[PDB]
Amino acid sequence: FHEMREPRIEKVVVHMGIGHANAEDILGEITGQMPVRTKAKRTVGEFDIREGDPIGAKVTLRDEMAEEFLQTALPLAELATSQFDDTGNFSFGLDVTVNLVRPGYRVAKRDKASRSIPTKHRLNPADAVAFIESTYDVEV
RNA sequence: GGCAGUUUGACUGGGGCGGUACGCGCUCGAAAAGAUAUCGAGCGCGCCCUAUGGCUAUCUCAGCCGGGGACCCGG
Ligand SMILES: [Mg+2]
Ligand SMILES: [Mg+2]
Ligand SMILES: [Mg+2]
Ligand SMILES: [Sr+2]
């Protein structure tokens, strides 16, 4: 039964939402791969009189690049619980977001015959804390 | 304008003044095919755009919720 049910880390997105940068240089060092900039939709009084323009950057880490990061990133954070999404997700922090999910996820990310993951296969807050906690650190 | 010839439109609950229903577009009036009037009700057009056109690739939007009214992740 299990195995095809045990949690997995599908992507860790690290980003800095400045609102202006060379911050890409450091985000790339702490992660290992090339960052990408983020534009800002809608204009605002806080001098964002530009819609399509650099406001921040991010990096999406998957597989080893993600673990090699969390091993040296999680120690930096502290909190837990009441900091976890309903989808068994959690973000702390420069921000660090961890996306967790069960094995049959591709079914909702592929092009052909897509389908939205059943709420029964959907990860849970508790199932999340467990997995993480059960991997080099403590909860709440 | 000393003098000559003329013009100075139409619509309109008479005419004048006001206005334009004088060329166009939409809803309603309009009575479940089409057509349909009033100085009928609501309101527009006389442009603007070299991309705000065209095709292809990739992608999904308003709004709300949860996690770190800018940005990031998920629903
Ligand atoms: Mg005369
Ligand atoms: Mg004569
Ligand atoms: Mg008719
Ligand atoms: Sr006369």
Q: Which range does the strand content fall in?
A: 15-25%
What's the order of the H and E elements?
EHEEHEEH
CATH superfamily: Ribosomal protein L5
Looking at the structure, what is the overall shape?
A: globular
Radius of gyration, whole Å: 17 Å
**So what's the CATH class?**
Alpha Beta
Report how far apart the termini are: 29 Å
Mind summarizing the main beta sheet? 5 strands, antiparallel
Give the CATH architecture.
Answer: 2-Layer Sandwich
Each distinct ligand: magnesium ion, strontium ion
Largest sheet: spatial strand order: 2-3-1-5-4
Helix content: 10-25%
What is the fold-level CATH name, i.e. the topology?
Answer: 50s Ribosomal Protein L5, Chain: A
β-strand number: 5
Number of helices: 3
Structural class: alpha+beta
Number of domains as seen in the coordinates: 1
Subunit structure: Part of the 50S ribosomal subunit. Interacts with protein L18 and the 5S rRNA, and probably with tRNAs. Forms a bridge to the 30S subunit in the 70S ribosome.
Pfam families: Ribosomal_L5, Ribosomal_L5_C
Family: Belongs to the universal ribosomal protein uL5 family.
GO molecular function: rRNA binding; structural constituent of ribosome; tRNA binding
